[PDB]
Symmetry: C3
Amino acid sequence: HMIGITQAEAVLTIELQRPERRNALNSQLVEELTQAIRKAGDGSARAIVLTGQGTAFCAGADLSGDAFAADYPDRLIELHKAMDASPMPVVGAINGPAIGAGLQLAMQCDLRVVAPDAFFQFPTSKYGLALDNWSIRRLSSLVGHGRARAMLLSAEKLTAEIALHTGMANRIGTLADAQAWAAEIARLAPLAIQHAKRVLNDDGAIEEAWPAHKELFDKAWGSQDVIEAQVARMEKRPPKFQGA
Amino acid sequence: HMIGITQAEAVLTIELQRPERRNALNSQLVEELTQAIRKAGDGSARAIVLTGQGTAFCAGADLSAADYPDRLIELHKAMDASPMPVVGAINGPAIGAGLQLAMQCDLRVVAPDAFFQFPTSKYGLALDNWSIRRLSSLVGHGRARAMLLSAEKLTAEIALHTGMANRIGTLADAQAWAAEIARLAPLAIQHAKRVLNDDGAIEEAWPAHKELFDKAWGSQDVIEAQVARMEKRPPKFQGA
Amino acid sequence: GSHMIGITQAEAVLTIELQRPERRNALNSQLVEELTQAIRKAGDGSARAIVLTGQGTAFCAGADLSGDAFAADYPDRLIELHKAMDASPMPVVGAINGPAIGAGLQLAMQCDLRVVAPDAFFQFPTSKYGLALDNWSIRRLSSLVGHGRARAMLLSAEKLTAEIALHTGMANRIGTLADAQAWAAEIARLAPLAIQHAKRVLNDDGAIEEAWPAHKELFDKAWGSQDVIEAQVARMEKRPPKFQGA
Ligand SMILES: CCCCCCCCCCCCCCCCCCCC(=O)SCCNC(=O)CCNC(=O)[C@@H](O)C(C)(C)COP(=O)(O)OP(=O)(O)OC[C@H]1O[C@@H](n2cnc3c(N)ncnc32)[C@H](O)[C@@H]1OP(=O)(O)O
């Protein structure tokens, strides 16, 4: 009910359809994606394009919110496991902003073709949250350790042009461009691609949090600053965090 | 008979001389190369330039033999274990085993019309882990995915951008730089090289990696890729 | 008395300024000690961020144990400084106002963020002096300028300019000390716990590595080598060195 699924040549196009929420990921959207990924090429598709309707690729977790629901991360993790395990290369057609879980989604694609007005951001430091290790590692490999530090410690927006610079974007362009590239890739040897992908994803990005990481993570998540962050936003005022 | 070795002051230059096959490696040219690396600084060399004759640095492999992969493996061990900096004068296209060899150099100067490629996904093959890890460290994880999953070329300008090329220039340029390097203190260069090479790229394949590797190599698609080329037609891969 | 560093605070930003401009802010045992102390005691304190910077034309030109009374426990005093920066909950924005060479480049890399002047450069000139680096300096350099350019900096003492610092990501911005402070100010209005978590994970990328056994030997040789002696002679003599590889 919340995604579009089409196929032309051997390219499955999976489209996030919540444009009125900038494709924010609630629980239902996350389940429907997972399913669409697992059932990709049941079936004759050799590649997937993943993209969002409207002006955003994905605005992150739904602030309504599943974002702060306790069993929401597991659905996200299962989504990511499904993409990682799929033998299909996923070309992300990033048609506009990708934030939070939405950045995570974008980075879990195998390749990225990015629209000129799209940007990338982890606003974690504005909301007092904390990321899983994989997000941090993969971001570091895609924009380089220095920019990652700036994105993670200060919520720096990564522009499209700069995403093209560091490698996070492979190409700057449109959905049609992404679909055309996926067509090429769909004509390549699948076993070679499946091998590259698996080895690539096993670069060590996938990392269980160290004990200090887990403690700092929980401490951030169950902090009062989390409340203050959303309140200041809705009240359209600056936050006053207390570090607790 | 297949390589040229010369020396000017402190700099040993090793030139691939199979420009008829665009310097494609085989049984012999690799084994000769291994010796040139070992028997360098035998000798008063403090720096090696590595390069290729004609239009190509090395366009891959051409075995038109059974221990070729061994000889290839030992070649890499040699450049890795070697105590001297190797400036790759990448004079033209560096493809497959050629990109492997170019990456095994400690530094790179790349001719303006040279490019780098792993076309494995056009031929249905798989790479070892080290090639993937090091390519990732040199062109960044993002561009590495595009090279690995889509067989995309890395042009010289982007090689300079990412760090794969330290400079754009000629064999002459490489030699000029290699000479300044020969004047640097060897023990410092040795320690840095060993630690740099030990960044984790020298990695043994995970089980799933090995399953997918063997699967790709023994696939029918590998034949299809070759037969399709010979028939100037598009491949129809089965994924088997 | 007097100090080798200056400490001021504007709102929640603590600016620490290295003040050995006579020596281009070359580190010694006292300066390093004063710096360690200024980092632990920050945010003790209403400060939520640290701007690190150098007085004069250089950020920090490396090391100069010359007049130093306790230059003996300078290597260990240097390890302490790096742990305190790594352990600090405060994000540290280095304002690299000039050349950061050697230990100065190590210090620069231990900062959480870097705002670099247009005339600054970065350099590990260890191959000109025949020394060896610890694994962390090498790993963290690799992450900040990419593996390719890392070999070039380490094997041939290549200078990374401001402009190519921005390119690789070594320099987050090209700006002035004020610019570094305006940015740190913003960061000081962010949520400390999120920052604390990220920094700790980021520093635990693997760059903190114990030397492999083969690494230690090459390091110990390089440092015990005659060429180290030679390279100093050749400089204090004002002439090219003749390195022997021993
Ligand atoms: C093997 C696998 C290896 C990996 C393992 C798994 C890895 C994953 C594991 C993860 C598990 C760990 C924990 C998870 C950690 C991450 C979870 C939290 C991170 C988050 O995503 S939090 C949310 C952050 N996002 C934001 O704050 C978005 C801010 N900006 C915006 O929403 C928008 O302004 C833009 C997206 C930029 C677009 O702007 P615009 O076009 O001007 O639109 P606006 O006028 O602002 O909004 C239009 C309408 O959309 C609505 N909307 C926008 N965003 C959301 C949202 N996120 N949630 C709910 N509603 C949303 C907005 O309210 C508005 O509604 P209207 O007023 O009715 O028109």
